[PDB]
């Protein structure tokens, strides 16, 4: 068959929820074609009003913008997993690259010190 | 038989009973009831059997007139579905100590009806074959675990 | 582009054309306003047909949700004349 | 507007969709778009074509090279 | 696109959508004409058990089997057109599509270079603002107030009005402007 | 906008959860949020992780390149999941025998070119001659030091 | 301009098609002009030497 | 062929090309004359030849780029030169596979005494 990816999903014609479904999946579907029905005729209203002039007011995506700006410190609680895979994620790669920049410079210093790296045409440093 | 129904298909719809539970009993109204008589008792999923004594055309023409054009065409083009149900290997053990007899079950998973390996693993469960304490058998019985029962 | 603009009565001629050379069609019963169902007899699978018949005729694609509505040689006329957005 | 041919010139037969159309009702069905799609195997676009006629096209004019450089 | 989609695709309707795909997944497989109305009429030839089935369980059932051979034997690029999604000219002319808005804001020696247009542009606003108060009291008397309400606008009852909800239907830009 | 229609905190109470589906203009049985992790999505409510190439492409949208409708509920990943950046439509073949079937072909070939860099299919020939002591004059080199002498003979 | 026609052949003009005539037989000149002049795209040199017919003594011969 | 044979036949009598020539040139001849170079190195130094091209049948080489500078525009007639520093290039390669020949009859001749 074909296998489900979360990067390559099922297609609702081959998935098996659409071909075992329910009176009540069905009054769902009808109900969210009433309320996509009265979203879009309060939009098209809004859209061919010519007492409009300015712009339409996206509640929703003022919605999304409020909520991936200014909510997310708001709704912070402290559990441990997100305070150990933070603390990982904001500390662990600056001890990582200081070991990579120390272990490469204390060799480059140590090299220069003794004498066995030669600048030969090294003017502008 | 419920039990091991319930412990051998865990969440699939081959774990409920038949008759379900007590908490699902008392709120059963009859639009509940009428919605599954106009859903699943449906004329092409519906036989009509009659073994002797009877005519097949007078059948045929007494099904033409009672039984003919019961519902053949769903609600809301919801057709039901029948899925493949896990088989989850389990135990379950209801533990009643001042109870006299014990009653102990253990079950494969076998291919079921439309494979047709039926027969074989029928002549492997009749191979082993069955008991209870009243056959008058005894020792000189054929199937070895009941003989060595 | 170099490609002519397309006049009513020219898609319309281009409309009969392909469907007067259809197997199941009678040429002196098909009019421009009849419907396929029920004044000429047709299945559910000759109606899509149709819309293939289209689809590799006049170079677009018209989707399913228009193409199971429409069922009769006028409005696939004014479908195809209101995609292509001709002036008559 | 525009003259369109008429559809009386299409026939079946002297296409590769005869072929196809007999073959088939041999196997016992018929074809519904095979007198529409023989605009492609009949009248002037009938014959196919061969690797000479499109690689070594112009070739017999090709063939005037000259040893006539004394 | 300029019907509306239901809230549920019934079964004749994804049989069919299965046929559209099945035959334009073929002739994407099946390059010549030949092949392409050979393998057409054996498409035909299993059409022909779908014909009559009656539980509708087993035509869901086959349903999905017909879907599974569809996805197992689909071209892994399909038949796109110019003028379809995913294609070759998928809304390319998009520079030509600015819309009718627009045309307020231009400059008066624009506005006196086309002087007939924009007073029919005038004339047509003219219409919009005197259909519109009756436009907009149309749609609250025929909303129907139970609990489904589908997606297609009604028509113009009344005689010598406009249909309801037009002008972002009529001021479209053309998809082959030039 | 004010508090109530804006976002905030994550519903305990099936009543806040109907009032929050309410708010998003979503179905109340639909409407499942974010689990409470603490990573400061709240209410936000979870929609499938399918990007917009996945919708209907020939039905009308209200905003016609995100494919979406106004006031249906945006996406968290939306700016992730936009017809500009990463599909996850549906490819013609599946995932793990797509990376099975890459992966082999790059390993593999790696390791054909370690096999054709282990035997370096030489012609039978030389190296190629270079005269007067291997061109250490025009190579570089001090012209008062002698050059070591390498002599190129005939045959 | 073309009168473009419907399910026929297009009127083709005779500059397209001695345009497109004498450059393919312009080519095709090319090509036998210059396999003619030389033959050196199959020849190259007269031929490669292989070592298996080569003599030993003015190979140099290897000792006892 | 050679590459068939040293993959997966024996690499002890068949040569490896960077170790050419393994066997010092003492053995086998009586003498050998070195190529006398025909073109010097004043010659070639104001002739401004690629440290690739400086072989030792330049000599050709510089005829060639003197016969197309004294013969342009007229390139066409300017192959025999061409020919003929190819066919000292095609002399300097039967040198290389002499050399390539003798080198693996040199090492017949080891195993052979071994
Ligand atoms: C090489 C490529 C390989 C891979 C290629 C692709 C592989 C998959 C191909 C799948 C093709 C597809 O199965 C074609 C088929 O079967 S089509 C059948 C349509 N036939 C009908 O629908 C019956 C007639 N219909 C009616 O009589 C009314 O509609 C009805 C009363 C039922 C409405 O009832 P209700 O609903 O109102």
Redesign the interface.
């Known amino acids: ?11 609702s ?2 998935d ?1 929820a659409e ?5 009540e ?21 809004q ?4 007492k409009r002039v300015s712009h ?1 007011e ?7 913008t ?3 700006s200014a ?9 441990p ?2 305070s150990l895979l933070g603390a990982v994620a904001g500390f662990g790669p600056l001890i990582f690259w200081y070991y990579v920049f120390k272990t490469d410079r204390d060799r480059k210093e140590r090299l220069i010190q003794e004498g066995k790296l030669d600048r030969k045409f090294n003017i502008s440093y | 038989f419920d039990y091991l129904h319930a412990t051998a298909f865990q969440g699939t719809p081959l774990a409920q009973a038949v008759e379900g539970p007590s908490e699902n009993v008392r709120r059963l109204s009859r639009t509940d009831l009428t919605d599954y008589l106009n859903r699943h008792y449906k004329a092409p999923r519906m036989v009509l059997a009659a073994a002797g004594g009877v005519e097949h055309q007078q059948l045929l023409d007494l099904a033409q007139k009672h039984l003919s054009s019961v519902s053949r065409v769903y609600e809301e083009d919801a057709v039901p579905g029948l899925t493949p149900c896990r088989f989850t290997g389990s135990e379950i053990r209801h533990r009643d100590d001042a109870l006299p007899l014990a009653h102990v079950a253990i079950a494969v998973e076998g291919p079921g009806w439309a494979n047709p390996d039926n027969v074989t693993l029928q002549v492997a469960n009749a191979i082993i074959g069955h008991y209870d304490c009243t056959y008058g058998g005894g020792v000189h019985l054929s199937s070895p675990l009941a003989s060595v029962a | 582009s170099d490609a002519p603009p397309l006049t009513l009565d020219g898609i319309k001629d281009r409309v009969l054309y392909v469907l007067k050379l259809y197997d199941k069609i009678d040429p002196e019963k098909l009019s421009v306003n009849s419907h396929f169902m029920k004044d000429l007899g047709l299945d559910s699978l000759d109606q899509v047909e149709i819309i293939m018949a289209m689809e590799d005729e006049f170079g677009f694609e018209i989707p399913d949700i228009d193409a199971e509505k429409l069922m009769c040689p006028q409005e696939i006329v004014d479908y195809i004349a209101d995609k292509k957005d001709v002036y008559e | 507007k525009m003259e369109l041919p008429d559809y009386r010139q299409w026939k079946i037969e002297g296409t590769p969709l005869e072929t196809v159309q007999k073959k088939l009702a041999a196997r016992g069905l018929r074809d519904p778009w095979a007198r529409n799609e023989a605009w492609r195997y009949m009248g002037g676009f009938a014959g196919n074509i061969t690797f000479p006629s499109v690689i070594l096209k112009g070739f017999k004019w090709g063939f005037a090279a000259f040893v006539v450089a004394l | 696109a300029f019907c509306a989609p239901p809230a549920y695709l019934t079964h004749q309707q994804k049989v069919l959508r299965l046929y559209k795909r099945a035959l334009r997944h073929l002739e994407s497989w099946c390059i010549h004409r030949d092949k392409y109305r050979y393998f057409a009429c054996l498409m035909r030839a299993r059409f022909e058990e779908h014909k009559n089935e009656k539980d509708m369980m087993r035509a869901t059932q086959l349903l999905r089997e017909a879907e599974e051979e569809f996805w197992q034997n689909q071209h892994p690029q399909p038949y796109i057109f110019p003028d379809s999604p995913g294609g070759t000219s998928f809304e390319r002319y998009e520079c030509y599509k600015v819309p009718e808005w627009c045309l307020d804001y231009w400059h008066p020696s624009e506005k006196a270079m086309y002087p007939d247009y924009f007073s029919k542009r005038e004339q047509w606003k003219k219409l919009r603002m005197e259909s519109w108060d009756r436009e907009v009291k149309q749609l609250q008397e025929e909303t129907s107030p139970d609990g489904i309400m589908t997606e297609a606008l009604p028509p113009a009852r009344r005689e010598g009005d406009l249909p309801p909800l037009w002008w972002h239907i009529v001021t479209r830009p053309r998809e082959r402007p030039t | 906008m004010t508090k109530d229609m804006l976002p905030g905190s994550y519903p305990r109470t099936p009543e806040e959860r109907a009032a929050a589906a309410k708010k998003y203009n979503m179905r109340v049985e639909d409407y499942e949020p974010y689990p409470d992790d603490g990573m400061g999505y709240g209410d936000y409510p979870m929609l499938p992780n399918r990007s917009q190439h996945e919708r209907d492409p020939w039905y009308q949208w209200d905003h016609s390149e995100l494919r979406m409708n106004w006031g249906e509920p945006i996406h968290w990943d939306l700016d992730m999941y936009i017809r500009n950046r990463v599909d996850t439509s549906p490819t013609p073949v599946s995932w793990d025998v797509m990376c099975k079937h890459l992966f082999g072909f790059v390993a593999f070939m790696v390791f054909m070119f370690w096999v054709g860099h282990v035997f370096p299919s030489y012609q039978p020939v030389g190296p190629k001659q270079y005269p007067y002591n291997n061109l250490y004059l025009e190579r570089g080199g001090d012209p008062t030091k002698e050059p070591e002498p390498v002599v190129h003979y005939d045959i | 301009h073309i009168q473009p026609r419907y399910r026929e052949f297009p009127q083709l003009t005779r500059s397209q098609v001695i345009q497109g005539e004498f450059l393919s037989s312009l080519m095709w000149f090319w090509i036998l002009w210059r396999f003619w002049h030389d033959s050196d795209a199959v020849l190259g040199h007269f031929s490669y030497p292989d070592p298996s017919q080569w003599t030993d003594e003015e190979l140099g011969i290897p000792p006892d | 062929a050679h590459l068939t044979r040293r993959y997966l036949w024996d690499a002890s009598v068949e040569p490896d090309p960077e170790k050419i020539p393994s066997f010092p040139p003492d053995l086998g001849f009586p003498e050998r004359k070195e190529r006398v170079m025909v073109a010097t190195q004043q010659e070639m130094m104001d002739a401004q030849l690629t440290l690739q091209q400086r072989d030792y049948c330049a000599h050709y080489l510089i005829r060639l780029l003197k016969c197309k500078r004294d013969s342009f525009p007229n390139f066409l007639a300017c192959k025999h030169e061409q020919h003929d520093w190819d066919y000292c290039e095609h002399l300097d390669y039967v040198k290389r596979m002499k050399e390539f020949e003798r080198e693996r009859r040199l090492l017949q001749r080891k195993k052979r005494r071994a």
């Open positions: 068959k074909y296998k489900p990816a979360p990067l390559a999903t099922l297609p014609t081959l098996p071909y075992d479904v329910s009176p999946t069905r009054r769902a579907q009808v109900e969210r074609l009433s309320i996509r029905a009265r979203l879009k005729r309060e939009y098209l209203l859209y061919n009003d010519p339409i996206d509640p929703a995506l003022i919605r999304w409020y909520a991936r909510n997310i410190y708001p709704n912070f609680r402290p559990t997993k997100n």
